[PDB]
Amino acid sequence: MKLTIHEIAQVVGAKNDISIFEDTQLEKAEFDSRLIGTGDLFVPLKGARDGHDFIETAFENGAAVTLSEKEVSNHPYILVDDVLTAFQSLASYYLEKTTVDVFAVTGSNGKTTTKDMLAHLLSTRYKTYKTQGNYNNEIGLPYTVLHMPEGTEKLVLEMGQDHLGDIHLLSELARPKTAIVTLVGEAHLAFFKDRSEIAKGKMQIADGMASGSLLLAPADPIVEDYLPIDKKVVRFGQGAELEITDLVERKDSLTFKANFLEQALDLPVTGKYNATNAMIASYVALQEGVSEEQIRLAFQHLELTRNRTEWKKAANGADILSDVYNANPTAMKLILETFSAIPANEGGKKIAVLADMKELGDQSVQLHNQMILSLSPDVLDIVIFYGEDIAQLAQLASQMFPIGHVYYFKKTEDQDQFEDLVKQVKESLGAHDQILLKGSNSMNLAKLVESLEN
Numbered sequence: 001m002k003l004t005i006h007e008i009a010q011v012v013g014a015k016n017d018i019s020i021f022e023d024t025q026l027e028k029a030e031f032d033s034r035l036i037g038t039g040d041l042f043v044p045l046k047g048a049r050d051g052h053d054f055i056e057t058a059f060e061n062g063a064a065v066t067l068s069e070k071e072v073s074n075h076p077y078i079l080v081d082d083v084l085t086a087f088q089s090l091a092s093y094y095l096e097k098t099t100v101d102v103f104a105v106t107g108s109n110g111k112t113t114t115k116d117m118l119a120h121l122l123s124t125r126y127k128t129y130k131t132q133g134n135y136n137n138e139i140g141l142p143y144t145v146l147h148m149p150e151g152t153e154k155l156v157l158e159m160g161q162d163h164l165g166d167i168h169l170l171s172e173l174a175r176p177k178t179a180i181v182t183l184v185g186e187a188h189l190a191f192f193k194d195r196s197e198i199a200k201g202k203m204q205i206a207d208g209m210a211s212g213s214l215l216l217a218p219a220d221p222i223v224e225d226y227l228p229i230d231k232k233v234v235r236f237g238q239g240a241e242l243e244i245t246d247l248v249e250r251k252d253s254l255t256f257k258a259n260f261l262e263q264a265l266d267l268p269v270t271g272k273y274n275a276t277n278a279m280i281a282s283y284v285a286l287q288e289g290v291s292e293e294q295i296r297l298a299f300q301h302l303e304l305t306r307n308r309t310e311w312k313k314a315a316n317g318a319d320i321l322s323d324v325y326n327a328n329p330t331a332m333k334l335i336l337e338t339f340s341a342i343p344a345n346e347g348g349k350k351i352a353v354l355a356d357m358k359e360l361g362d363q364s365v366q367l368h369n370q371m372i373l374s375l376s377p378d379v380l381d382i383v384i385f386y387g388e389d390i391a392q393l394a395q396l397a398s399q400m401f402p403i404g405h406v407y408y409f410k411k412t413e414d415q416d417q418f419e420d421l422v423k424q425v426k427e428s429l430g431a432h433d434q435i436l437l438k439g440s441n442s443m444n445l446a447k448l449v450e451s452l453e454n
């Protein structure tokens, strides 16, 4: 990250006197205090607690300067109106300065995403960086841009949406060279009206793209009214300008041929949607000067990720939502709001299994309690706490919640009521019930869900 503080304070609009602190060359940018090294820029956001609380801690860890929405004593800080807003600006500007080729992608669905596939393909010929894990939103994307290894030639960004209009924001930020739109099978929906609003919001991806730029989009008539008018649009799907003309799915592997490819392709994956992901990633890669030779070979040794946490289903038809990704409180908070923001199925309730989060040192217990502000009795019918540090939160909830709507289960160096946890959960869960399971990946938590999908 080739950035200095004085430069950061220009682009960012610093509200304070900046030439007071030395203009040092920054290193890494982080919002999670635990990740700060020497020379790092702290960016304090509205999480479970406000970032600014950990400005103190960030410099103990070696931060050289931090973004701030207030006066900060004897520490290099940049004064601004909205740290997040500042943070976006900073990312836009860094793209404009390094001038990397950005490839914008949507829908995470499969065992391997179009974001993963494409990066992997581009990596055979060019120096490539990409979105890590699920950092695809108004926090996630800036963060990626600012973590780009010095010299990256191509950058595959994934962009996702919570509300309509979010992708517009990022396509405007990133001003992509090329974009891919894919469609992920529906739940009973999120904060959206229908598949239409969704597709409308998804198609926004080209808002920040130049004329005659390349955009792939589904054969599906639903995207029709939302196509750009001055772009190079290449549709994929049965009967379209690109289609898989044959397919074989084995136990683990999968072979297929695309009309515009002279040879078959081989992936160690399964599901028709993975072939479609492979083809389109495969087609843009051709546009960027990668040989079909180099591509067959790359697919040879492909990388399955962690299952990009959608909904699954237990052995009674009840909707599970297990979120492995991001072990940290703001992520606990965010999902709780997502979970409870969703409507419950008809004649079916809303359970939450929360488990100890880790690596919170001397703040664990404070931070676990903080979750209470995201726990409504209105929406959440039963709430199951497992672990130790969750304790007081379990207590808090038992106060705020109707009698016998809360269960606690111990886990320490002296006892492990896991056996009982399971017994309880498998009594609470019904054929129309939605269940969240969030907390540090542990042997015991992973152990639980397989018994549910038994």
Ligand SMILES: N#Cc1c(NC(=O)c2cc(S(=O)(=O)N3CCOCC3)c(Cl)cc2Cl)sc2c1CCN(Cc1ccc(O)cc1)C2
Binding pocket: 031, 032, 033, 034, 045, 046, 047, 048, 049, 050, 051, 054, 057, 134, 135, 136, 137, 139, 140, 326, 328, 329, 330, 331, 334, 359, 360, 361, 362, 363, 364, 367
């Ligand atoms: N609030 C809060 C905290 C964090 N929040 C986040 O990491 C965070 C995570 C997320 S996120 O949900 O993980 N997000 C990342 C990218 O976009 C998709 C999902 C977001 Cl969007 C925003 C934030 Cl600010 S990380 C963190 C805290 C407070 C506690 N922490 C450790 C700590 C322990 C003891 C101390 O004394 C100091 C710090 C680290």
